[PDB]
Design a binder for these strands. Structure first.
Length: 198
DNA sequence: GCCAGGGACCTAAGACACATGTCCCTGGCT
């Protein structure tokens, strides 16, 4: 509907930077992130946002404590560079979320959610400590919401995420074209997990 | 005992691990 989110929430967008998404498909992914951010009350007192493109490493474009205006944050999200890497590592970006983004829980009153937008399957070698990163995030009360996009999304890892906590709800889409159709449902679900201000 | 696959966990409050260690299930190899 005409829904907007004004809760105590740290929302992290993790964008698959592999060639499983074309440059075109990746523009539609960024558009979805921008569309989502337009339904957020972005502020240090309300919804804080982070945006990372992940390949075999993590490229952070927005940090939670970046004191820039929302208009500028939505622009930075719009111009996230297409990588088209051979590998996108869900393990790598969850490790990055655990040890860098949520290194310190210095805003304990807010809910913490990582939207994991995945279109690929990492080499098994890289998945060694996948479950421990997901469990590590659970122990920081970080909700991991996997969004499977294309037919190469790691369904094994989506299921492994779902089982670790009841609030780790999976969204399994056929392509990026279905993202805009579920924006209201996804943003509504994220928001209802976050507490209202006193 | 060795190798290749699939899982469960400790090294958990910042790491550096795409790494060691323990346990369980398959399939090969004197």
């Amino acid at each position: 509907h005409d829904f907007y989110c004004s809760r105590l929430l740290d929302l992290v967008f993790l964008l698959d930077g592999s060639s499983r998404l074309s440059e075109a498909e990746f523009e539609v992914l960024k558009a979805f992130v921008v569309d989502m951010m337009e339904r957020l009350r972005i502020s240090q007192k309300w919804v804080r946002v982070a945006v990372v493109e992940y390949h075999d490493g993590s490229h952070a474009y927005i940090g939670l404590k970046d004191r820039k205006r929302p208009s500028e944050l939505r622009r930075i999200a719009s111009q996230v560079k297409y990588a088209g890497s051979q590998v996108a590592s869900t393990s790598e970006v969850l490790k990055y979320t655990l040890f860098q983004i949520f290194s310190k829980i210095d805003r304990p009153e807010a809910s913490r959610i990582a939207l994991l937008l995945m279109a690929s399957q990492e080499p098994q070698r890289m998945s060694r400590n996948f479950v421990r990163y997901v469990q590590g995030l659970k122990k920081k009360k970080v909700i991991v919401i996997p969004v499977g996009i294309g037919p190469h999304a790691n369904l094994k890892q989506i299921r492994l995420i779902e089982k670790q906590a009841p609030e780790n709800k999976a969204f399994v889409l056929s392509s990026v074209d279905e993202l805009e159709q579920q924006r209201d449902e996804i943003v509504s679900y994220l928001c209802d997990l976050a507490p209202e201000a006193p």
